[PDB]
Design an enzyme around this catalytic site. Structure first.
Site, mmCIF file in Angstrom:
data_model
loop_
_atom_site.group_PDB
_atom_site.id
_atom_site.type_symbol
_atom_site.label_atom_id
_atom_site.label_comp_id
_atom_site.label_asym_id
_atom_site.label_seq_id
_atom_site.Cartn_x
_atom_site.Cartn_y
_atom_site.Cartn_z
ATOM 1 N N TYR A 140 0.177 -1.855 -0.013
ATOM 2 C CA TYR A 140 0.305 0.296 0.367
ATOM 3 C C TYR A 140 0.569 1.023 -0.254
ATOM 4 O O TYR A 140 0.046 2.101 -0.324
ATOM 5 C CB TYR A 140 -0.812 0.306 1.496
ATOM 6 C CG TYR A 140 -2.179 -1.009 1.447
ATOM 7 C CD1 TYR A 140 -3.463 -0.160 0.204
ATOM 8 C CD2 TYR A 140 -2.011 -2.199 1.971
ATOM 9 C CE1 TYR A 140 -4.357 -1.292 -0.401
ATOM 10 C CE2 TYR A 140 -3.338 -2.932 1.532
ATOM 11 C CZ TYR A 140 -3.927 -3.257 0.434
ATOM 12 O OH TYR A 140 -4.904 -4.222 0.011
ATOM 13 N N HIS A 145 -8.446 1.245 -6.723
ATOM 14 C CA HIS A 145 -8.248 0.925 -6.635
ATOM 15 C C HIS A 145 -6.031 0.605 -5.954
ATOM 16 O O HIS A 145 -5.926 1.464 -7.339
ATOM 17 C CB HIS A 145 -7.674 -0.793 -6.226
ATOM 18 C CG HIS A 145 -9.639 -1.546 -6.312
ATOM 19 N ND1 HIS A 145 -9.924 -1.539 -5.299
ATOM 20 C CD2 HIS A 145 -9.827 -1.439 -6.918
ATOM 21 C CE1 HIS A 145 -11.169 -2.118 -5.750
ATOM 22 N NE2 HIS A 145 -11.316 -2.076 -7.135
#
Lengths: 145, 145, 145
Positions: A25, A104
């Protein structure tokens, strides 16, 4: 209105950016993402609100509120709800005059098998994945195009 | 009690009747549905409460509250939660002395594939689909039979 | 800290222990379970909080709060969310320094087919099933080992 109005929705667990795996991430936290979005939109004369919740129903409430308040576009990362929340899908579909881009951070196509299919994306106007945090900027550009 | 007591639960997105596709969901809005139910129940000397929420957990809370407050019957349209909320299913099953009828406005059998199976219906006493808003009236009649 | 700190999370419908089928879930209610846990932990000099919610998002909020407040271990029975909440799974995975044990009261392997697979268990450190309420005690012992 006089300037484009965008709502950015981040779903469950996205407030834990930075705390979550950095190699998936990225290094930066949720506050960083919000600031990045806010600064970019200011530079483009775009009105933006960044919203996050872990609650499926609150996300739906927020989408519905966007119907009534002049929102032109939604950028949404539904988090894990992407793969199972037909309720968020139906909410997105219900706001037929609001353009929607799904985001995303990671390349969900190459994630765990349960992340490979999005039940929300079929009712969105677009999508972006796998670009890191800059995917949110790219989504804003899609709405502002 | 002296009159039958029914709770009508509408799940996510059902407050957007009218705003949603009229050729699927009909021309009339959620307020219209509530008024229709209220007027019908008054004509039948039935006590009714109409409740709506987008939150799965609030729906479960409401079902649990019905255990303690004398509710005889529940009419529930779980919205998209119909197809995946085993938590609402277990809530409905937990109130074993409350009769339950599942309602869908549209003919879900002929909708998108993801709408074909209900995970809540196996624990309900009945169901009705595909009758438009009058399905809620038919469900009340099933409970009042 | 000076004593181990555990959070016990019970998910939807678990506040209806006792009211639910006794031959599945046992004779005793949710208050009994809480008291049993509290007394056991006091006897072991373990700090414990018992929390229950029907809301998926509140469970995720509670897991996130445990990151910031010194929690060492989580015992979680996600209820029916076990089988579909990838959002709770990702929350549990996000707290990488908190040990986690999944509990089920019943033998979920021999329940309805929809209960056979847990989407939360792969990110937990352990699990226990099929021991009745004493599974929660066994989970505490796993964390305290």
């Amino acid at each position: 209105g006089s300037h484009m109005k965008i709502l950015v929705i981040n779903g469950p667990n996205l407030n834990f950016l930075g705390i979550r795996e950095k190699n998936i991430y990225g290094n930066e936290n949720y506050e960083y993402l919000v600031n990045m979005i806010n600064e970019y939109c200011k530079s483009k004369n775009i009105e933006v609100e960044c919203y996050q919740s872990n609650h499926e129903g609150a996300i739906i409430d927020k989408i519905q509120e966007a119907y009534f308040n002049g929102t032109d576009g939604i950028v949404i990362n539904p988090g894990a709800y992407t793969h199972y929340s037909y309720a968020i899908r139906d909410a997105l579909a219900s706001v037929s005059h609001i353009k929607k881009i799904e985001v995303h951070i990671s390349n969900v196509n190459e994630r765990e098998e349960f992340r490979h299919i999005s039940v929300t994306e079929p009712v969105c106007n677009g999508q972006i994945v796998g670009q890191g945090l800059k995917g949110y900027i790219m989504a804003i550009d899609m709405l502002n195009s």
